[PDB]
Amino acid sequence: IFTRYLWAFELTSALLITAALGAMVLAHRERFERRKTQRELAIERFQTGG
Amino acid sequence: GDEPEIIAVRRGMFGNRDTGDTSGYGRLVRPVALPGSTPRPYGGYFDAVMDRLAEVLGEERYAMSIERVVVYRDQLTIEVSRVQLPAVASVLRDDPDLRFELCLGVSGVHYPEDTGRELHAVYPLMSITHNRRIQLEVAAPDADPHIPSLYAVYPTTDWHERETYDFFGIIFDGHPSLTRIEMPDDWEGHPQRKDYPLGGIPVEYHGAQIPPPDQRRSYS
């Protein structure tokens, strides 16, 4: 692996990076869709409460 | 009305509901009257609280809303007229000088002998800011047990309006959902009403049994 195929071994790191980037870009919802925290959900006007 | 609120009339000495164990003592007639309106100079901060309530409420509205004021055992009970309950509750909660932010609950009590006012709801209100305490008393007839729900003013009254409906049938109209909370929704009757039987069973014993205390004699 580390003599004859070190090049492919290194490129597997590129495969991993691309997988991580794809997961983050396509699946990681950002701030605009973050679910409200219990703290945030516990204050709305008077959260559930009233 | 202005006379003290008669809730029950007991006939005969010794607090006996029945005919009497001894002849000749059953002729006494003593009405059991809860205290009537207190003379105006209320003690302590009660006088200030009522002065402020009458200032915020118009004289006409104050007369229409406050049926009675009872200072009993250094405790203030505002017999508030039904229908006006939400208005006075809002005034008490919101007004800076009154500011009764903490409503502690709603307690139902039943007066089957109190004509037109059988059901009473008691709202113990506390103002932490001023460290003051009062009670509101709202009376509804057994035939029309409806009362304005204070849910908008005091959300805590939820589960207290529900509990008192469950145990007395007081319909707090305007309540988001006045469903039974203690009894099963399928339950029949309202247990804490005086007419509702205790529902016990006889206590067994070798050769005998003791009926439930409600069936046996009493001298209340």
Swiss-Prot record, chain B:
NDH-1 is composed of 14 different subunits. Subunits NuoB, C, D, E, F, and G constitute the peripheral sector of the complex. Pfam families: Complex1_30kDa (PF00329). NCBIfam families: NuoC_fam, PRK07785.1. Keywords: Cell membrane, Membrane, NAD, Quinone, Translocase, Transport. Belongs to the complex I 30 kDa subunit family. NDH-1 shuttles electrons from NADH, via FMN and iron-sulfur (Fe-S) centers, to quinones in the respiratory chain. The immediate electron acceptor for the enzyme in this species is believed to be a menaquinone. Couples the redox reaction to proton translocation (for every two electrons transferred, four hydrogen ions are translocated across the cytoplasmic membrane), and thus conserves the redox energy in a proton gradient. One of its GO terms (molecular function) is NADH dehydrogenase (ubiquinone) activity. It is found in: Cell membrane. GO terms for cellular component: plasma membrane. Its EC number is 7.1.1.-. Its main location: membrane. This is NADH-quinone oxidoreductase subunit C. It catalyses: a quinone + NADH + 5 H(+)(in) = a quinol + NAD(+) + 4 H(+)(out). It is an enzyme of class 7 (translocase). InterPro entries: NADH_DH_suC, NADH_quin_OxRdtase_su_C/D-like, NADH_UbQ_OxRdtase_30kDa_su. It comes from Mycolicibacterium smegmatis (strain ATCC 700084 / mc(2)155) (Mycobacterium smegmatis). It is a peripheral membrane protein.
